Design a binder for these strands. Structure first.
Ligand SMILES: [Mg+2]
Ligand SMILES: [Mg+2]
Length: 85
DNA sequence: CTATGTAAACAAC
DNA sequence: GTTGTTTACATAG
């Protein structure tokens, strides 16, 4: 294992999360939820705040890679939708 | 040198 | 306390 959760890179995990959504878009909190619900290593980490290393790494990847695109979200108290490409 | 993971400064909310 | 962008640095290859 390249990482504690497997060989997937964070970009690959985020990509799988987005692709699993029916409308192919998820908010940042939803990407974290997908990790906690689906990746064994993260199953006992839902109780963490945003300073958690892995959450910071997710945010870093979303901004760094052009493959992740940010779209405005109409829902009043919710953040941006993240999509692929 | 590049890809990747990790940490943190910093803005804006 | 979160969301988002960014620099900085470490290491594997
Ligand atoms: Mg991006
Ligand atoms: Mg060393």
């Amino acid at each position: 294992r390249r990482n504690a959760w497997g060989n997937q890179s964070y970009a690959e995990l985020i990509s799988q999360a987005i692709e699993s959504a029916p409308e192919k878009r998820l908010t940042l909190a939803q990407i974290y939820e997908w990790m906690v619900r689906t990746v064994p290593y993260f199953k006992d980490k839902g109780d963490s705040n945003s300073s958690a290393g892995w959450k910071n790494s997710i945010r870093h990847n979303l901004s760094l890679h052009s493959k992740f695109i940010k779209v405005h979200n109409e829902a009043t108290g919710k953040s941006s939708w993240w999509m692929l490409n």
